[PDB]
């Protein structure tokens, strides 16, 4: 989900950006407030939700591996 | 929008299908009712909305070209 998840433009939904090219070069180069807030939030929300459920399950398990 | 618009799976949103490979081979080969209803509706809705506004504008214009 981290390496292949992408984020699509709201006004042109056919151009979707992966994180490592395109979305990292927005946050490292842009000086526009609205373009930086878009990337952030978007990527955030999406990957967020995903890693969420999985993360919870993972936390629950990795504790059983450590307590044993 | 027609040639580059894609449709993503609901349970795995990282696999997205274009129309000409993948989405045409669902409707031509599958015998599953729920997989055929998914493709249809999805593609439909998306391309639908897009071509919608543009289509209206286009209809409005092409009439001025024909009346002149």
Residue with tokens 């009439």: B63
Transcribe A28-44 into DSSP letters. Answer: HH---HHHHHHHHHHHH
- Phi/psi region, residue A22 (left: phi>0; alpha: psi -120 to 50; beta: rest), is left
The span from the CA of A48 to the CA of A1, in Å, is 10
Nearest CA distance, A9 vs chain B (angstrom): 13
A4 touches chain B (CB under 8 A): yes
Count CA atoms within 13 Å of residue A6 on its CB side: 17
B5 touches chain A (CB under 8 A): yes
Q: Which residues pair with A7 in a beta bridge?
A: A17
Strand pairing report for A16-18 and A6-8: antiparallel
The span from the CA of B56 to the CA of A10, in Å, is 21
A14 touches chain B (CB under 8 A): yes
The span from the CA of A58 to the CA of A14, in Å, is 33
Total residue count of chain B as it appears in this document: 68
The span from the CA of B59 to the CA of A55, in Å, is 50
The span from the CA of A30 to the CA of A24, in Å, is 10
Specify burial of residue B67 (Cβ count, 10 A radius: 0-12, 13-18, 19+): exposed
Nearest CA distance, A6 vs chain B (angstrom): 8
Q: Nearest chain A Cα to B3, which residue? A: A14
Residue B31, token pair as written in the block: 């015998």
Q: Which residues of B touch A4 (CB under 8 A)?
A: 14
Of B48, B28, B27, the residue nearest B38 (C-alpha): B27
């Amino acid at each position: 989900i981290y390496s292949t998840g992408k984020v699509c433009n709201p006004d042109n939904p056919q151009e979707c950006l992966l994180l490592e090219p395109g979305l990292n070069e927005i946050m490292a180069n842009s000086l526009d407030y609205n373009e930086r807030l878009w990337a952030w939030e978007s990527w955030r929300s999406e990957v967020g939700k995903q890693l969420r459920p999985l993360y919870e399950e993972y936390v629950v398990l990795k504790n059983e591996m450590a307590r044993a």
